[PDB]
């Protein structure tokens with residue numbers, strides 16, 4: 001099985017989350033390609049992957065803003081080959097904001113409308129993902145069981 005993980009992370013929490021997922025997947029035998037959104041090209045990006053996981057923190061406080069490095073990929077998701085693709089999303093946020101993990105919501109809805117197959121509800125991490133490390137592992141399990 002081939003997995004792509006693409007993360008947008010400003011302070012490293014969604015990156016940590018991505019690394020934790022990647023290790024879970026690889027330990028189970030998946031091929032895993034992990035890329036920072038800051039360096040990816042959207043065109044054809046999901047091509048040849050059995051599973052794509054997109055990670056993005058939420059910013060903006062009074063509005064939903066996606067993690068800065070992830071915006072160009074978001075704005076180009078129609079060119080990624082999401083139709084029929086198995087995908088799931090994750091990201092860090094903080095529930096004291098009005099729009100908790102709103103980036104995850106946004107990405108999920110964009111993927112769905114593109115015809116992607118969302119194989120699991122998004123992983124919405126409240127606070128430090130190091131304090132949610134067992135939720136991360138479990139979600140990576142759930143994703144493997146859902147494909």
Ligand SMILES: Cc1cc2nc3c(=O)[nH]c(=O)nc-3n(C[C@H](O)[C@H](O)[C@H](O)COP(=O)(O)O)c2cc1C
Pocket residue numbers: 008009010011012013014015056057058059060061062063064065067092093094095097098099100101102127
């Ligand atoms: C000024 C500021 C604004 C934020 N806005 C939100 C928000 O609107 N929604 C949310 O759920 N978290 C928000 N957060 C929390 C960040 O998502 C959180 O710090 C997260 O761990 C950053 O993950 P990253 O290091 O992967 O970028 C904000 C954080 C800061 C400091």
